[PDB]
């Protein structure tokens, strides 16, 4: 009986306003770099109940929920290393950014 | 007076349920609830314009913090509608406003209201068959029967 | 229908044994006194006030009536009052026995005396050159002075010693054997009850009293069968004068621990169920360890038992339509209460402590202990209404001494145990005295409802007749 | 606002007393769910397709199973009197009956619901078959001459 | 400085809609066993105000805010560490199968 | 994997009903007290992208989309141990309230 | 809803006897039985045709294990009929429905049938000695008397 | 019915693991024709602890 | 007409001797005390589970004020607490009376004692 019953699953919501990003777009880039350029896009992996990670296409899709989702199903996106966040709506718009989620890149930090 | 939070605080008060004769602080809960319910009433009042019109505004409550702020309503209307929203609420503290309040909020709505009823009298144009009298310029004019509608 | 509500006993399940179990009023003390439109009002427990330092922690406390003054031993270190008047060994509690011309600490397992001049000197045997009879004293275990004669039992058996008269230091010098032997019970504790030695042993109590011989050899003390109680108590210090009589707890030997007071040679309980249970939640050596004791002050008149992790009261003037215990706490969470070994003195109450190397005095303005916050805590019993609606629940509160406006969370269970949301509502506010704490829609009662009042303030609470509008 | 039809069902209660918010005791999620089949019942007994009291209410659908979250979609006047409603029908669920005043309200509300409806579903019948146009119109040279209903 | 202020109660939405799922289903189990199993089911308690765990039925129930409630209002639920999840609304359907909530956590290099 | 996606501020809505707090305000405070007393309160700082820590004002602000927020840009708050909250809405009704929570942040392991 | 347990289940619910409002739990042999109740119920109204007409079906209770699941009941007449049959199944349990259950069974039925008495309404033909008008195609297609019944 | 032995019996829920707010109800009793007696057998590993017995002898 | 129904005592018949006997509460402690809106409550006994094992039935029990220890006496052996501190015979019931320096258990007509030191 140590830690809380809570939800791991994220949800989207706008910034602004208590709405979800409805077909909105995740772009997960390098550390402090702009996602949006195809260049600065790392290999983002989906990680199945089993554990049989595999890699997707970068811009990320978000179902009317604000769950994640892909091919009509919900999914958990995993990284190799480090990242930034970036949300964008559907119509088009930096609702959020994040320079570095973790705040330290795992990869190199491993040795 | 000048504030929605006015009129919902002297409904409460002529309810009884919190005031400074009674010793007793609005709660906030309260305070939220019964202007959530003033809001109703004077919508429903309104009716989209058909009804009864006071200069109330909706604020929006989407925008603000909270809806309670500011009201349109004239200055005669005031009693009337907060002793109506005193009656609306009286049944949510299982409370029942006594025979004075009800009285009094008849009268109040039918005070708003007579202004109205006046206004909306009006008379209807002349039938579309009826000619005007030989005794008219408008025989010369040609225009002989009255305008329809 | 305004319907009142006791809080003087708060009533609920109790989730491992699925039995109802008495919820106890935490930090109050019922008054039975005709207040507003009900019969007693709630208050809070007086609060403690650092009033000097001492060294290590409370061991001891005994109102010396030779000097008119309090002795206190605390941690290694005796004290009188304010000043230090001589050194005492030991870690565990030690139980005293002033005199007219000595002061006293059995510790250790010796009676050790405290002369009022300065020297110390410690019971032993006659000289063997002296020609007085010798003895076995053994370990001591508790003490007690009656006419002049300091009575302590050996450790592990039911003999109990006196001393002698001319000098003290030494026991009596021909008859100074005495035995408890009307059960095969080894003497748990010793005390002094009107002009009775009574000895409690581990499954009967007996009392001693003068024969008045004056032949040398003769027993100057015979059992007195006539008054014998077929109980004991639990631990050496697990008795204390109460009501012109000694309360105690009951030995494991005759059954379940059960808190008792002696009348008439009679133990008649004065524990509810609740509070026996709550005992019998103790092992043998942690119940063991405990101690209780008297305190009294306003109207009230405490019975304070100190176990190892609960401290119930007993108020005995708050008994009228039962027993009445109330559970006293210190910190929000369940630690221990702090103050122990309470006396009075002078003119105000002092208390030592459990933990920190300080004692406290007893001050009735305010509620905080050492200045720190606590918990106050009143229950109302579970009580059936279905389909009910309950609007107005209203508690008088005497307003006004409090330093900032403290709040209460007042909260409703439904099943006994677990409780729901807790609504924060002004209780005191400082230098207004005549605020209402009223709550209204509080909703419906579907099969039951009980009512938890918690109250974190540094100012004494004073809760009145709870009213509920269950219409 | 009430913008749910949970919303509507929460504040029902409320007008009830039972779980009004600011309250101790508040009811089963169970319980809110069945009082919105309760509401959605009632509107569909008043809709009744066409013909019925037309509120512009928006019924509940497998693609959003918490009906409760669904935006109820009434008309900003009509919110009071379904509000009202469903308080004297929730009622006896818990054995406790309206008081006068929520019965005068819900009674008020659903005639200021129909009025607007009736005023828009008058609509006097065309001529019968048989009424001649008269000789004043010129559409008699036109052959025309009785009228045509429907 | 090590600690986060955040929403305490947890929200549980559903997957297809930005809707809490009112009257929702929550099932607790063994790690990557199915928990509506009642062998399969752990331990779950309540966090009251007293400090104390008291354990109550499994098919926790969520309100039409999101947040879980017990047979009155808002508790606070605990279990051990291992929790699996299952989100079942009303109606009988699925929402979520999380299996193991610990590999949910943002920075599984700790682990 | 080493580090998976997820939403950080959290968002913060009503006990009863979905919508929600608007400009309402989070106070923090000891474990099991009254989280308004200053005597009460414990200080919480914004840990920026940088992870400058700064204190800031105690009463939070909280837009229409249930986040903190100050100088109008939303805001990480951290506090500096266990602690109890009071969640007020604009009016200033409580939310709920709930005497112990934890939750250390996942970020800032390399420290 | 969409199944016979769940009308009699509401039925039950307003009548008081099993809600989880009231934390009880329908009695199996209470759902069966006024399950059975509800098919009696419906079985007066339609009346073989003749009657207020629902598009309730009857299952059969004979190749089924109950006949309690689904019903073709339009989703207007749900409310009507579940308040008539929790009014009905009232002095089973020696409760009687309160004013508010009979008063909305009252506006259900009337609701139910309003309907089919506004098509049923129709109007009888002309009578077999009632002649056309010389004004008509069939005084030359010899027809003249209306054709009977 | 006539206090030596008794009638059909019917199983009731008492306990439930883990759910403190259960009640025991038993609707639809029966008449009362001359004489009547309940008697409540528990088989169980578990306490049971009944209160008062209400009856709506209507 | 809610009537309330004690069950701290039940009544019937005897189907042997016709008489109106007292049908008694079976595993219940009725407790005195004031829940709901009854003035008792019935409690069933507390359960038995075995604490360790031991030789043969139980014939006696007392509780040794002098050692401050249980002696109980079961099948052959005179139990102390645990630990088997000694061999009784016979069968039947046998009835014990602790002492300072003996414990002692009349067995088989006579006064057998068990001194402290074996």
């Known amino acids: ?109 491993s040795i | 007076i000048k504030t929605k939070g006015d009129l919902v605080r002297a409904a409460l008060r002529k309810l009884g349920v919190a005031s400074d004769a009674t010793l007793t602080d609005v709660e906030p809960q309260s305070m939220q609830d019964a202007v959530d319910d003033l809001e109703a009433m004077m919508a429903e009042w309104y009716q989209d314009g058909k009804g009864i019109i006071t200069g109330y505004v909706f604020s929006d409550d989407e925008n603000p913090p909270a809806e309670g702020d500011d009201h349109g309503l004239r200055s005669s209307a005031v009693s009337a509608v907060f002793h109506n929203l005193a009656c609306r609420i009286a049944p949510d503290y299982a409370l029942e406003a006594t025979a004075k309040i009800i009285a009094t909020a008849k009268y109040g709505k039918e005070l708003l209201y007579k202004q109205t009823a006046i206004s909306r009298a009006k008379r209807a144009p002349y039938p579309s068959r009826m000619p005007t009298g030989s005794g008219n310029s408008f025989a010369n004019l040609n225009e002989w029967h009255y305008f329809p509608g | 229908p305004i319907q009142q509500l006791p809080m003087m006993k708060g009533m609920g399940k109790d989730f491992k044994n699925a039995d109802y179990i008495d919820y106890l009023p935490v930090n109050m003390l019922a008054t039975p006194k005709e207040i507003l439109n009900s019969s007693g009002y709630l208050r809070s427990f007086p609060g403690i006030t650092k009033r000097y330092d001492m060294n290590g922690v409370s061991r001891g406390v005994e109102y010396n009536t030779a000097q008119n003054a309090v002795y206190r031993v605390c941690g290694g270190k005796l004290y009188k009052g304010e000043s230090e008047v001589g050194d005492v060994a030991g870690s565990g509690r030690v139980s005293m026995a002033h005199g007219r011309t000595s002061q ?54 039911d003999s109990w010693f006196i001393t002698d008269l001319e000098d003290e230091s030494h026991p009596d010098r021909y008859s100074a054997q005495y035995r408890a032997e009307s059960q095969p019970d080894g003497i748990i504790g ?151 070994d309470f006396m009075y003195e002078g003119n105000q109450i002092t208390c030592g402590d459990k933990s920190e190397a300080v004692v406290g005095q007893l001050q009735f303005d305010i509620s905080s202990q050492y200045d720190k916050q606590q918990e106050h805590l009143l229950f109302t019993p579970l009580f059936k209404a279905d389909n009910a609606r309950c609007f107005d629940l209203e508690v008088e509160s005497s307003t006004g001494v409090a330093q900032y406006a403290d709040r209460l969370f007042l909260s409703a269970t439904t099943d006994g145990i677990n409780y729901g949301r807790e609504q924060m509502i002004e209780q005191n506010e400082p230098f207004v005295y005549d605020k209402r704490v009223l709550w209204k829609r509080v909703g419906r009662i579907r099969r039951l409802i009980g009512f938890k009042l918690r109250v974190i303030t540094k100012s004494p609470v004073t809760l009145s007749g709870c009213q509920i509008r269950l219409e």
Chains 1, 5, 6 share one sequence.
Not at chain 1, 56 to 85: E, R
């Open chain 1, 1 to 109: 009986a140590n830690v809380v019953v809570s939800n791991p699953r994220p949800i989207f919501t706008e910034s602004r306003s208590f709405k979800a990003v409805a077909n909105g777009k995740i772009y997960i880039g390098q550390i402090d770099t702009d996602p949006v350029n195809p260049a600065n896009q790392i290999p983002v992996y989906i990680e199945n109940e089993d554990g049989s990670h595999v890699q997707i296409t970068q811009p990320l899709i978000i179902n009317a929920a604000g769950k994640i989702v892909y091919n009509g199903q919900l999914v958990k996106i995993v990284t190799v290393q480090g990242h930034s966040m970036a949300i964008y709506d559907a119509n088009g718009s930096q609702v959020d950014y994040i320079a570095n989620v973790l705040k330290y890149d795992p990869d190199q930090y």
């Open chain 3, 104 to 157: 006293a600490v059995g510790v250790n397992g010796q009676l050790v005396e405290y002369r009022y001049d300065g020297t110390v000197k410690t019971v032993s045997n006659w000289p063997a050159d002296s020609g007085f009879t010798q003895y076995e004293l053994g370990s001591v275990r508790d003490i007690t002075r009656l006419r002049g004669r300091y009575a302590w039992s050996k450790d592990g058996t």
């Open chain 3, 190 to 340: 010793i005390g002094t009850w009107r002009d009775f030695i009574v000895c409690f042993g581990s499954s009967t109590i007996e009392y001693f009293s003068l024969t008045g011989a004056t032949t040398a050899g003769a027993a100057l003390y015979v059992a007195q069968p006539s008054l014998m109680v077929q109980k004991s108590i639990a631990g050496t210090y697990c008795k204390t004068p109460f009501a012109d009589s000694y309360a105690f707890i009951s030995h494991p030997a005759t059954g379940a621990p059960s808190v008792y007071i002696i009348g008439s040679g009679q133990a008649s309980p004065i524990a509810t169920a609740s509070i026996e249970k709550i005992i019998r939640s103790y092992t043998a050596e942690e119940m063991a360890t405990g101690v209780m004791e008297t305190l009294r002050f306003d109207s009230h008149e405490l019975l304070i038992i100190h176990l190892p992790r609960h401290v119930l009261v007993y108020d005995a003037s708050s008994s009228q339509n039962g027993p009445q215990w109330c559970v006293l706490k210190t910190g929000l969470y369940d630690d221990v209460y702090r103050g122990v």
